Structure 1
Amino acid sequence: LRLTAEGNKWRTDILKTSVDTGREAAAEVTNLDKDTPADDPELLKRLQEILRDNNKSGILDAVTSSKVNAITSQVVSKCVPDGTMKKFPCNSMQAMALSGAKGSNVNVSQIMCLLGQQALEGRRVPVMVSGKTLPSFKPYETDAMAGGYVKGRFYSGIKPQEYYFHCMAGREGLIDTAVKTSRSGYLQRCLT
């Protein structure tokens, strides 16, 4: 699972460019200036309205999700497999990933490089009525990480907020699987 020093340097140097991802997404969705401070009262008002109305909330979530997914793809492509200290023939994890015995390139990517963004349905993350994603975040915060963008990895651990978001996503997935476990056998019984 480990990476080389240059691989970790690549990963960090690409992640540190994602500081303003959420801020730029908000600036574009609000039709404000491209370079707008995150504390602008106009920006806060626009974000308040966007939180209030579900359609604009979904639009902002889609835009920011697109940007952060692009960043995640960049990180994964740059790092794997040019950062792993053990290469494919001997790297057991990457070998059973590529060979398709188990797992997937997505699993390897989120283990070694980045979880990315936790998508709750088609939306980033539910927000409290005060525009505060978690009790640990500024109201109307323009950070992708605050919006559910997990900058950590399963190898080096995740911050508590990222753990909370990942728990939410896993809960959503488990709910969907439990609901669809026995969705309809009546269709098949009627047809037969």
Structure 2
Amino acid sequence: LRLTAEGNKWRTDILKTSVDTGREAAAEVTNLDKDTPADDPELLKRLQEILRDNNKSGILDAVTSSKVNAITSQVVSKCVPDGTMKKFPCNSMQAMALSGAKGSNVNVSQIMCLLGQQALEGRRVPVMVSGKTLPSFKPYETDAMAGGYVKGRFYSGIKPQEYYFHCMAGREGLIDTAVKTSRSGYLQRCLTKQLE
């Protein structure tokens, strides 16, 4: 489960280019430009305007999620065959994923590289009334991390802020399971009386 020190420098340098990603997607949806700084009062006014609308927050989520999924796809596509310490036959974690024995290449990427964007009900991490996604962050923070982008992996650990968003994504996969089977159970019963 360990990347080699050559390849572990690779995921640092690509994740070094993600600190600007949150503002640039937020500067794009506000129709500003020129790398206006995050503390711009004419920027923070527009982010509050976006916050009160369910439409405009859907746009800012979709722009910023698809922009940070690129950095997620650059770290994986550079590391997981190449940056690992043990290569394929001896690396049983990959051989369980390549053979189809158990797991996928997504499980191997979240262990070795990073978790990625914690998408909640399709959109992104929810937000308070004050423009704060947690009490740890500045209100109307245009950080990618503040929106729920986990730059940590399960090999090395996830920070307390991004451990809280990952429990949000963990629970929506469990409340949706409890409401899963009751839906399609009655659809099948109802077919098997006519077509019976």
Q: Deviations over 1:166-187 (max 9, x none)?
A: 0000011111111103323222
Counterpart secondary structure, 1:146: helix
Distance (Å, rounded) in 1 between the aligned partners of 2:187 and 2:8:
52
Equivalence for 2:15 = 15
Using the TM superposition, give the Cα deviation of residue 64 of structure 1 relative to its aligned residue in structure 2, in angstroms.
Answer: 0.2
Distance (Å, rounded) in 1 between the aligned partners of 2:24 and 2:115:
21
Distance (Å, rounded) in 1 between the aligned partners of 2:189 and 2:126:
39
Structure 2 unaligned spans of 5+: none
Instruction: Tell me if structure 2 keeps the 8 A contact 1:28–1:34.
Output: no
Using the TM superposition, give the Cα deviation of residue 72 of structure 1 relative to its aligned residue in structure 2, in angstroms.
Answer: 0.1
Q: Deviations over 1:113-150 (max 9, x none)?
A: 01011000121111010001100000000001010000
Aligned pair count reads 192
Distance (Å, rounded) in 1 between the aligned partners of 2:187 and 2:177:
19
Counterpart secondary structure, 2:14: helix
Distance (Å, rounded) in 1 between the aligned partners of 2:176 and 2:12:
34
Distance (Å, rounded) in 2 between the aligned partners of 1:100 and 1:34:
47
Distance (Å, rounded) in 1 between the aligned partners of 2:144 and 2:40:
17
Equivalence for 2:110 = 110
- Name the TM-score, length of structure 2 as normaliser: 0.96
Distance (Å, rounded) in 1 between the aligned partners of 2:101 and 2:2:
21
Equivalence for 1:124 = 124
What is the percentage of aligned positions where both structures have the same residue? 100
Structure 1 unaligned spans of 5+: none
Instruction: Tell me if structure 2 keeps the 8 A contact 1:24–1:34.
Output: no
Distance (Å, rounded) in 1 between the aligned partners of 2:75 and 2:119:
18
Instruction: Tell me if structure 2 keeps the 8 A contact 1:115–1:150.
Output: yes
- Name the TM-score, length of structure 1 as normaliser: 0.98
